Amino acid sequence: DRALSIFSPDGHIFQVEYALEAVKRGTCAVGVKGKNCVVLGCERRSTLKLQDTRITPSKVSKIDSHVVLSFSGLNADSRILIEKARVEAQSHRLTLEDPVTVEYLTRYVAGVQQRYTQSGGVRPFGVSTLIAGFDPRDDEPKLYQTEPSGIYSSWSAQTIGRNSKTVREFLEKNYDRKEPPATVEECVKLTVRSLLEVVQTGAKNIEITVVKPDSDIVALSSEEINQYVTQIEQEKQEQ
Amino acid sequence: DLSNSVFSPDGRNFQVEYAVKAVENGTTSIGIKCNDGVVFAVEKLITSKLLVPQKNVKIQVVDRHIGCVYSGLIPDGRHLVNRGREEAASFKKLYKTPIPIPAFADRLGQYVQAHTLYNSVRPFGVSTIFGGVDKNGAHLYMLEPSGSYWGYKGAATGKGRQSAKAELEKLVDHHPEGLSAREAVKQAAKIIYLAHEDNKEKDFELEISWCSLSETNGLHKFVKGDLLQEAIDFAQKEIN
Amino acid sequence: MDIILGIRVQDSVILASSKAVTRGISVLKDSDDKTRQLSPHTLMSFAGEAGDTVQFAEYIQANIQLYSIREDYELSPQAVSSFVRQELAKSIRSRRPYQVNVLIGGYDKKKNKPELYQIDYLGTKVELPYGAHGYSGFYTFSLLDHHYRPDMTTEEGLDLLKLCVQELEKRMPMDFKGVIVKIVDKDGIRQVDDFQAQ
Amino acid sequence: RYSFSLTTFSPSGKLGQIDYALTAVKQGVTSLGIKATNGVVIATEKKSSSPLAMSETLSKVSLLTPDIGAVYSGMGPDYRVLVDKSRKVAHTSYKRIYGEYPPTKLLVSEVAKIMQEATQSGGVRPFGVSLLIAGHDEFNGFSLYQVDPSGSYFPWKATAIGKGSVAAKTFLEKRWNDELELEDAIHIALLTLKESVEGEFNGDTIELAIIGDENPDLLGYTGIPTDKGPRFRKLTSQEINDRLEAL
Amino acid sequence: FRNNYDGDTVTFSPTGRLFQVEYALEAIKQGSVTVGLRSNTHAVLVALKRNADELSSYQKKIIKCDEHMGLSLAGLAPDARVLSNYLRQQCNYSSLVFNRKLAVERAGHLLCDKAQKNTQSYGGRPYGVGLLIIGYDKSGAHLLEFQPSGNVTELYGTAIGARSQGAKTYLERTLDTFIKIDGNPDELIKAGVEAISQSLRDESLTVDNLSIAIVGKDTPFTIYDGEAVAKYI
Amino acid sequence: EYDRGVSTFSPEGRLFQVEYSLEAIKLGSTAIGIATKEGVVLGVEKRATSPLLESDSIEKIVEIDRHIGCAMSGLTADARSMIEHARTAAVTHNLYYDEDINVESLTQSVCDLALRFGEGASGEERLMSRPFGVALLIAGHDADDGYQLFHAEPSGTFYRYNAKAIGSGSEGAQAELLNEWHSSLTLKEAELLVLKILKQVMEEKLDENNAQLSCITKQDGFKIYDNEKTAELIKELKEKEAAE
Amino acid sequence: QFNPYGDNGGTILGIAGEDFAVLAGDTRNITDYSINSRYEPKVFDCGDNIVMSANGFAADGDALVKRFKNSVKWYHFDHNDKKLSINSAARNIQHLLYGKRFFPYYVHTII
Amino acid sequence: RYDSRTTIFSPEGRLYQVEYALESISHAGTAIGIMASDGIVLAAERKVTSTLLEQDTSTEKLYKLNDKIAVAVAGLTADAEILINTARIHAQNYLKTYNEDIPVEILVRRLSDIKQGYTQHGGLRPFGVSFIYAGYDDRYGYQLYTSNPSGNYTGWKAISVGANTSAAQTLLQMDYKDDMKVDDAIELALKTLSKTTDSSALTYDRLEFATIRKGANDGEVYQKIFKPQEIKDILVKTGIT
Amino acid sequence: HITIFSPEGRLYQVEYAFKATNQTNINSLAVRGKDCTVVISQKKVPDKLLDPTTVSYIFCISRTIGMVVNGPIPDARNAALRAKAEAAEFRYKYGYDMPCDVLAKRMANLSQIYTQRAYMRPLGVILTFVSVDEELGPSIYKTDPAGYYVGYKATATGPKQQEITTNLENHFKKSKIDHINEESWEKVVEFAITHMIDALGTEFSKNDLEVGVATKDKFFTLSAENIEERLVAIAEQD
Ligand SMILES: [Mg+2]
Ligand SMILES: [Mg+2]
């Protein structure tokens, strides 16, 4: 019973399930927040490197001056979502002045991923995504995850893509639910080491993008990310 | 063989045969072209004592001059009648002159036609008898699921068509000059009784209508009342 | 009509725009900015029909900002003004035209030079050293034809403009309630807020 | 059986139906065409169902424009209607925009654009015909073109399609040089067409035309300098069999 | 072992049958019971509201369509509501436009021609519900039997539903009597009530299980809910 | 396995596609509703994958209006749809009549939404192939029949309840409730009741994180009990067991 | 040109008594300087203990009432014969009336 | 869930339908594009051969898309022409609107987005083409881009597609200095290309070329689709009879 | 099965379509006069309960064009109608009455279109159109369900095709012209009946047949009575 727009005996829509199986096939992303920041980490499939470093793409994408998102799964797809989101980001601001609420955004995105699971003659987006940012005139960090089916959810820190299960575990016994990572510096320190499981040496496979309130934003440079690998392998050897 | 549009290895549309097969299975209907005008009759089947008599009419008029009846799938019949009803009334509004029976059939034949062309639709499950008058006389035809119809001197379908057929055969020769308007009815009344002898354990109610410039006056009227009774009794004597 | 001025100088552009708002008889707000920054280095003053005005501006604004984060690269004053003109060109033959005139000031970073485009509601564009929509030109254009020099400093321009204003006051029937002035340059936009105490 | 039947990719990459369409081609009648330095020639056999049909009322080489004609091999009907629309598109999408008629290359492409539609779309089987369009235009000179149901097309010097192609394409291959004048071609055509027959070889049983030169006669009018005449020339039953002399 | 002829509402069996429509009649036999019976002064609908659980309400089966008309149903609620709903419009169209109260014969016509469409086109399915209709026009009382097969028949009384038989017979017999109960409502009902109680098996009817409806010569269509039917037990 | 394709009729006249959708709702976490002449309670089991999900993120119980709350079970994506149509259906009515919509009248609209799905359409266009994989616990209060509780089933049908429970351990509770419920139950009573059947047929150690609890009254309207009220209420619960 | 409107005189009146209410309005009907009917009612009961009347242009008037009396009926069908609180009826009428905003009902109506 | 339909998803999140097409490429003529710090090169080997086929007053591998952009095809002939057409149009709308030349990155993107479109809806099959995009815009200078039918695009230093592009690929990885002036590339082009051929040897007729270059003497960009002659010649220059 | 290419590109629904045209069971033949045209078709009336007036496989499309069809009556009445109206619409849209050869084109065209786009099943009938237009005189063109027409100097449709055919063919190798030498239609008519009787090893009464004649712009169906008198004519002269 797999060609879904129909139900399994036990009430499943196996297609929608399988689609998730592709998000795992894809690369990996992870987000974390503090009481002032929200960092987004990602890896880099540095595989057939005989291509200009310069203009070729990188996971994290700004949707509005104060909000960004990342994914894992089909690049081919992902792009189209980002675009449609960016558009709605303005259509709002236009017809309402007030710039978008991160919760709202996601709900829109999830509404689209959700639209591609109803009419026969369309197929679901093989993309699950992490969306982070700070609401207009607000200082409370927000993190949400959306996935293929159409569900949106807020997390304190979450990860998607291949080997998410692992790092997830790691995170689970590191991120203190009671108090979030205070300083930005260390909030990063965290995420970085959490990716060092799958990375397999080299800040040459680790992308970091950091977001603060009041529409500030800022991707990271290679050495910056390296000075962390450094100051971490150091305390690992010190244990 | 399972879809409506398709053809068989040697050119055959099976869905239409089954259509036909269902037409036979239902009640029996007839009609007769006489002196001037026509006469129809059908077989309402009283399945219980809880059926109000003189009630569920299977015969229907079109415009104010066309008798009409059928058998097979009852809702299919009803449906088809509606289209015929528009076509008529539209034409009428357009040309003013009440619609020529000759063409009418086609309008319907053409509509029954279509439902043999596409797979997404279901073939018409009824054979239909009808007629009326005009300037150049009265006519009578009989449309099948295939959409093919023609003009007959009298027609019949549903369960026992042969009974009435060989029955209609006789009339031809002894009255090769068209049977009397009056006698037409009472004769029809009989031809039904004879053909009913299959649903014999189950009683029934006979319905009759007719057209004639002399009797109906150009119109189509329901044979009910006094003429209706004697026409039965008339049948009731020969019923031995 | 209202007041919309603009003047291109050395390594910047300057936009003047009256502050008052009128409803037939009374004057509602009189501290109203008829401006709308499109991107960090592009800016647009406008005057036109009551509703048509503020809607269109924001709408244009929207598109740009969109393009600018999508691409991550900023759009050139030249091309910007081209698109605005595009939109009005259609607008004019639409079931209902947005009746609005505009001035667009920007600093083209590639050429490292300031450009200024005047555009009426009919979809009529032109790069200019300075301009003014409506009746605003009649009263001033002369003084500009007179004293204007391409080499003038940012300050030089203000003085000039300041003089144009003093005139508009002196011979214009309407009370425009003063002006808000703004500068676009290699540094971006800032407001000469001082033009009240100046 | 396979993943054939339907418009979708076979495991390798081969598009299904399309190939079976190019089958109704190979099975169809034999036809050829030769581009020849000052003229171009297109021809095809006229295998009559029976002698009771006056085959004289069914063109195989047909006029697309007074400078372009084309021909086929495959499903008769497909060619008949394909042509008419083809003529229109040569108008609506060109002549009514520019005032004149279109160059070979483009009209072909335009026909191919239509050939295309029938593919990319479920609910419609492509055309079972390949066309040989020959023409000319003031800037590109003489042209030869083939058009498969797959939409695609190529520029030829000369070739054949249909039953006798494997063979003909070889005979033609031998007999070709770049200086041949039209009559050389015309002659050469017949000799290829020669083998490819099973029936007869007289006039009325061979359909052939060619793109040659202006026919100031054919117009019907006179007084305008630049308007001089069609190049498309369908040789009639007579002109032919006479050329059967020099073999 | 096999049967291919039962795919869509659109395919004929070699003999000339529509299994899909035949099945819809089976779901009709699955739902709760209900009865209708007429005379010359009134018409009556009596139905057995069936509840799901013991902590839940009993699903009602009667519906008004105008001061003078209504019906009961055996089968799928949704399907029913739609049909009755469409019906409601049809009366309204007449009243507003012509200002005449809709005749029952005609009411059945429309419900035939309506349910009809679903037997001829691909894609859909047929209506899973039967209805007993009652009303009082200018030809006095009337009562209808409707099937998804688009067959509407004019009767003197009847039942549909699970174990609908026992009432159909009680009725078949006590006919000669009730057809003559004119001027007295409570009589027609008690009669109808007996006809139905003549079909129970789980248990007897209570104030919660019972539901009645009536319409007549001066009795605009009204329904009796629960404790209001108390007397007729 | 032939006879499993949406608008297809089983030979016993049955629609499995529908019936399976029900089997979806099963997989949802448990939800329980209790109606007392004092007010109506809605409580649900949460069940969270990891401790990094922010509980409040799971909108299993939601407000439909000042006078109507709701709890869903099963497919979360589908929920959001019904919740939105409903929320809209409500406001719309108020704009038209300057009053409040009858709980059932509302409920009706929602069921009217559900069964409105075609397969190419034998007349009516219905853009949405299959049925909903979710049920509802609608619970409000109009001033005609006072406090009310309803069960929304994908089949386009519904019932009124005194107490009902949908989700994973449906019977585990329904059995329990079947013999715990009585009219003169006060509100305080009802809370500790829902709170007990959950814990029982629940899975883990009961605490505010794995259980959201709410209620609605004529007085204040639909209110979703913060983690304090719930937390202590657990105590008044786990304490009385010790005795009897 | 065609003039789609007209005036049929009439005068209606409504007073809200402490615990009652009256809706009075005469029975004359006019056109220009002529008479149409000595007796022609403009005030009606629409059920649910609610009276209505719309004076100005007859046709637009009676159409509104008719269009309304129906919208009452339908309210019962969808909410189990719940009574229409007068306040409700009015909010409802507003809409009906506003439906034809750019081609209004040429009438002053009262309930 | 196996093969058929594009709207289908296999139990492991694979879209076979695509993966076939995305592979169908391995049937087309070997096309190559290379980057240099002064010009871009597009090389291509023709297919469909016989002896009775022209190619001079035409082409079918190298298409000029913009006065500043060019592409190398490798797929379905029929497909390509359709995209090639709408790719040209859109590029012009950009011009007509912003009155400026359309950026390569952007253009590639929009196209990849249509190819992607056909990758997700029922009633249509994906395009079976692959493109080597080569062009310049003053935003990011010279650019070499590529895209498959999966709708993914890519920035490359020097790439190949079509036939033996695994073999051909590696040959490139060897000789390639980032600055590598154009002539060394044009040269390299053939070196790479020859080595990967079923023809007894490399003959001009069965070959297509073009280059892009800009400067101070031009002040703007100039691109050349090489005509039958120039080729028959430069071939000799690289030492070929 | 279904309407899209076989492995040897021959989509049989079109092929199957043909047998059904034939299947009806009637023989239609046609020949040219010199200032008239004629078609023969059999009129087998089984059921003694019908009415021969209502029977026929030949209808009056236009004032001058007639049509015969060897094929199933329902599908024919359709083709009849459309065609009948195409000409109707034509004269209107163009100023002059539509000729034989052309109608047969949009007609074949039409049947091609259907076939390729799949908007319906092809009609299982072969239409044989006749008339005489003042551009090509005695015209005769035929069309099949596989959407396709062509020309005949004289043709035949039926269960027994080639027999009716071969006769005419032999009669043609001798008469050597491409039509029938003769001035009067009555006379031509006589000729065909002749060539058919001879061709079936069968005889026909005055109702067993069906024939039509196309004149100098005034097409008419041959009726029951006039029909017999030709049998009178061709009885002794044989
Ligand atoms: Mg079909
Ligand atoms: Mg109220």
mmCIF file of N, CA and C in Angstrom, chain A residues 44-100:
data_model
loop_
_atom_site.group_PDB
_atom_site.id
_atom_site.type_symbol
_atom_site.label_atom_id
_atom_site.label_comp_id
_atom_site.label_asym_id
_atom_site.label_seq_id
_atom_site.Cartn_x
_atom_site.Cartn_y
_atom_site.Cartn_z
ATOM 1 N N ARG A 44 29.688 20.559 5.300
ATOM 2 C CA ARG A 44 29.947 20.830 3.892
ATOM 3 C C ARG A 44 30.384 19.566 3.165
ATOM 4 N N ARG A 45 29.560 19.095 2.228
ATOM 5 C CA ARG A 45 29.867 17.894 1.444
ATOM 6 C C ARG A 45 30.991 18.244 0.472
ATOM 7 N N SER A 46 32.198 18.413 1.015
ATOM 8 C CA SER A 46 33.390 18.729 0.228
ATOM 9 C C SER A 46 33.808 17.401 -0.392
ATOM 10 N N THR A 47 33.214 17.067 -1.548
ATOM 11 C CA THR A 47 33.480 15.784 -2.249
ATOM 12 C C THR A 47 34.210 15.779 -3.650
ATOM 13 N N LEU A 48 33.737 16.549 -4.655
ATOM 14 C CA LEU A 48 34.401 16.615 -5.998
ATOM 15 C C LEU A 48 34.947 18.036 -6.174
ATOM 16 N N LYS A 49 35.926 18.396 -5.339
ATOM 17 C CA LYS A 49 36.511 19.731 -5.319
ATOM 18 C C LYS A 49 37.540 20.121 -6.384
ATOM 19 N N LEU A 50 36.995 20.597 -7.501
ATOM 20 C CA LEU A 50 37.681 21.111 -8.693
ATOM 21 C C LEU A 50 36.572 22.050 -9.203
ATOM 22 N N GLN A 51 36.239 23.028 -8.370
ATOM 23 C CA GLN A 51 35.167 23.974 -8.646
ATOM 24 C C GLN A 51 35.492 25.271 -7.914
ATOM 25 N N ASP A 52 35.194 26.402 -8.539
ATOM 26 C CA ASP A 52 35.488 27.689 -7.926
ATOM 27 C C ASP A 52 34.907 27.779 -6.529
ATOM 28 N N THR A 53 35.772 28.169 -5.602
ATOM 29 C CA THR A 53 35.420 28.308 -4.190
ATOM 30 C C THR A 53 34.337 29.375 -4.058
ATOM 31 N N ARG A 54 34.692 30.539 -4.594
ATOM 32 C CA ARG A 54 33.901 31.757 -4.599
ATOM 33 C C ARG A 54 32.351 31.693 -4.569
ATOM 34 N N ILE A 55 31.712 31.720 -5.749
ATOM 35 C CA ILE A 55 30.227 31.733 -5.896
ATOM 36 C C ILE A 55 29.325 30.505 -5.661
ATOM 37 N N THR A 56 29.911 29.312 -5.528
ATOM 38 C CA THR A 56 29.101 28.102 -5.312
ATOM 39 C C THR A 56 28.522 28.060 -3.859
ATOM 40 N N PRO A 57 27.161 27.992 -3.761
ATOM 41 C CA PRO A 57 26.241 27.952 -2.600
ATOM 42 C C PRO A 57 26.683 27.469 -1.213
ATOM 43 N N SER A 58 25.909 27.873 -0.198
ATOM 44 C CA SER A 58 26.147 27.510 1.207
ATOM 45 C C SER A 58 24.880 27.584 2.048
ATOM 46 N N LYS A 59 24.476 26.408 2.511
ATOM 47 C CA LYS A 59 23.291 26.120 3.314
ATOM 48 C C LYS A 59 22.471 27.214 3.986
ATOM 49 N N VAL A 60 23.095 28.019 4.833
ATOM 50 C CA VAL A 60 22.365 29.077 5.515
ATOM 51 C C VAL A 60 21.865 30.146 4.546
ATOM 52 N N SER A 61 20.609 30.551 4.710
ATOM 53 C CA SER A 61 20.014 31.573 3.840
ATOM 54 C C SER A 61 19.188 32.598 4.638
ATOM 55 N N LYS A 62 19.419 33.886 4.374
ATOM 56 C CA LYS A 62 18.698 34.969 5.036
ATOM 57 C C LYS A 62 17.317 35.081 4.352
ATOM 58 N N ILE A 63 16.241 35.178 5.134
ATOM 59 C CA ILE A 63 14.900 35.312 4.543
ATOM 60 C C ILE A 63 14.367 36.743 4.665
ATOM 61 N N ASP A 64 14.896 37.430 5.669
ATOM 62 C CA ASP A 64 14.572 38.811 5.962
ATOM 63 C C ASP A 64 15.746 39.238 6.822
ATOM 64 N N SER A 65 15.988 40.532 6.901
ATOM 65 C CA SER A 65 17.098 41.034 7.694
ATOM 66 C C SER A 65 17.231 40.428 9.106
ATOM 67 N N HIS A 66 16.127 40.022 9.718
ATOM 68 C CA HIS A 66 16.200 39.471 11.059
ATOM 69 C C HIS A 66 15.997 37.970 11.151
ATOM 70 N N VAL A 67 15.725 37.299 10.036
ATOM 71 C CA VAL A 67 15.507 35.835 10.041
ATOM 72 C C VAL A 67 16.179 35.016 8.923
ATOM 73 N N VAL A 68 16.671 33.834 9.304
ATOM 74 C CA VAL A 68 17.333 32.937 8.377
ATOM 75 C C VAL A 68 16.909 31.519 8.636
ATOM 76 N N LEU A 69 17.289 30.644 7.709
ATOM 77 C CA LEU A 69 16.931 29.240 7.766
ATOM 78 C C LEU A 69 17.973 28.321 7.110
ATOM 79 N N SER A 70 17.887 27.020 7.397
ATOM 80 C CA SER A 70 18.789 26.045 6.800
ATOM 81 C C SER A 70 17.987 24.781 6.566
ATOM 82 N N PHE A 71 18.552 23.860 5.807
ATOM 83 C CA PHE A 71 17.848 22.622 5.502
ATOM 84 C C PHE A 71 18.783 21.416 5.365
ATOM 85 N N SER A 72 18.238 20.346 4.801
ATOM 86 C CA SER A 72 18.975 19.144 4.531
ATOM 87 C C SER A 72 17.965 18.366 3.753
ATOM 88 N N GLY A 73 18.443 17.744 2.688
ATOM 89 C CA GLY A 73 17.578 16.978 1.819
ATOM 90 C C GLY A 73 17.901 17.404 0.399
ATOM 91 N N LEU A 74 16.872 17.491 -0.435
ATOM 92 C CA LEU A 74 17.061 17.857 -1.824
ATOM 93 C C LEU A 74 17.330 19.336 -2.075
ATOM 94 N N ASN A 75 18.528 19.643 -2.564
ATOM 95 C CA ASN A 75 18.892 21.032 -2.858
ATOM 96 C C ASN A 75 17.899 21.536 -3.884
ATOM 97 N N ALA A 76 17.715 20.699 -4.901
ATOM 98 C CA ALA A 76 16.826 20.968 -6.005
ATOM 99 C C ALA A 76 15.531 21.562 -5.486
ATOM 100 N N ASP A 77 15.031 21.009 -4.380
ATOM 101 C CA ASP A 77 13.787 21.478 -3.779
ATOM 102 C C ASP A 77 14.018 22.725 -2.983
ATOM 103 N N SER A 78 14.670 22.517 -1.848
ATOM 104 C CA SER A 78 15.019 23.573 -0.913
ATOM 105 C C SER A 78 15.001 24.961 -1.525
ATOM 106 N N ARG A 79 15.723 25.150 -2.630
ATOM 107 C CA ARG A 79 15.764 26.458 -3.243
ATOM 108 C C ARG A 79 14.400 27.068 -3.433
ATOM 109 N N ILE A 80 13.503 26.312 -4.057
ATOM 110 C CA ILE A 80 12.142 26.793 -4.314
ATOM 111 C C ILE A 80 11.377 27.220 -3.052
ATOM 112 N N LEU A 81 11.608 26.534 -1.938
ATOM 113 C CA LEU A 81 10.925 26.918 -0.721
ATOM 114 C C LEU A 81 11.445 28.297 -0.335
ATOM 115 N N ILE A 82 12.757 28.390 -0.096
ATOM 116 C CA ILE A 82 13.428 29.645 0.293
ATOM 117 C C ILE A 82 12.869 30.831 -0.491
ATOM 118 N N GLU A 83 12.797 30.675 -1.800
ATOM 119 C CA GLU A 83 12.264 31.726 -2.610
ATOM 120 C C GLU A 83 10.849 32.099 -2.178
ATOM 121 N N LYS A 84 9.944 31.131 -2.167
ATOM 122 C CA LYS A 84 8.552 31.412 -1.809
ATOM 123 C C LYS A 84 8.349 31.983 -0.404
ATOM 124 N N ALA A 85 9.262 31.645 0.482
ATOM 125 C CA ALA A 85 9.217 32.164 1.823
ATOM 126 C C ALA A 85 9.583 33.660 1.754
ATOM 127 N N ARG A 86 10.764 33.956 1.205
ATOM 128 C CA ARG A 86 11.272 35.324 1.034
ATOM 129 C C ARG A 86 10.215 36.263 0.492
ATOM 130 N N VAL A 87 9.460 35.759 -0.468
ATOM 131 C CA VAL A 87 8.380 36.501 -1.086
ATOM 132 C C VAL A 87 7.305 36.822 -0.049
ATOM 133 N N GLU A 88 6.801 35.802 0.650
ATOM 134 C CA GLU A 88 5.769 36.018 1.656
ATOM 135 C C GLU A 88 6.221 36.944 2.767
ATOM 136 N N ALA A 89 7.527 36.970 2.984
ATOM 137 C CA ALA A 89 8.165 37.796 4.001
ATOM 138 C C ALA A 89 7.928 39.270 3.758
ATOM 139 N N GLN A 90 7.835 39.616 2.479
ATOM 140 C CA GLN A 90 7.599 40.992 2.077
ATOM 141 C C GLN A 90 6.096 41.241 1.920
ATOM 142 N N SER A 91 5.402 40.323 1.248
ATOM 143 C CA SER A 91 3.978 40.467 1.015
ATOM 144 C C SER A 91 3.283 40.819 2.327
ATOM 145 N N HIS A 92 3.846 40.335 3.442
ATOM 146 C CA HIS A 92 3.341 40.597 4.800
ATOM 147 C C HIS A 92 3.614 42.059 5.151
ATOM 148 N N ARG A 93 4.893 42.347 5.313
ATOM 149 C CA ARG A 93 5.392 43.683 5.598
ATOM 150 C C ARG A 93 4.672 44.767 4.777
ATOM 151 N N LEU A 94 4.352 44.446 3.533
ATOM 152 C CA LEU A 94 3.665 45.390 2.685
ATOM 153 C C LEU A 94 2.263 45.613 3.251
ATOM 154 N N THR A 95 1.461 44.546 3.212
ATOM 155 C CA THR A 95 0.066 44.573 3.657
ATOM 156 C C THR A 95 -0.165 44.666 5.170
ATOM 157 N N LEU A 96 0.896 44.825 5.945
ATOM 158 C CA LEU A 96 0.734 44.920 7.383
ATOM 159 C C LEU A 96 1.753 45.796 8.041
ATOM 160 N N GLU A 97 2.659 46.395 7.251
ATOM 161 C CA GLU A 97 3.772 47.247 7.749
ATOM 162 C C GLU A 97 4.723 46.418 8.607
ATOM 163 N N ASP A 98 4.236 46.041 9.789
ATOM 164 C CA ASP A 98 4.955 45.229 10.750
ATOM 165 C C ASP A 98 5.631 44.061 10.038
ATOM 166 N N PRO A 99 6.939 43.850 10.301
ATOM 167 C CA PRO A 99 7.723 42.756 9.716
ATOM 168 C C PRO A 99 7.348 41.468 10.442
ATOM 169 N N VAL A 100 7.415 40.368 9.708
ATOM 170 C CA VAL A 100 7.060 39.020 10.172
ATOM 171 C C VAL A 100 7.562 38.427 11.494
#
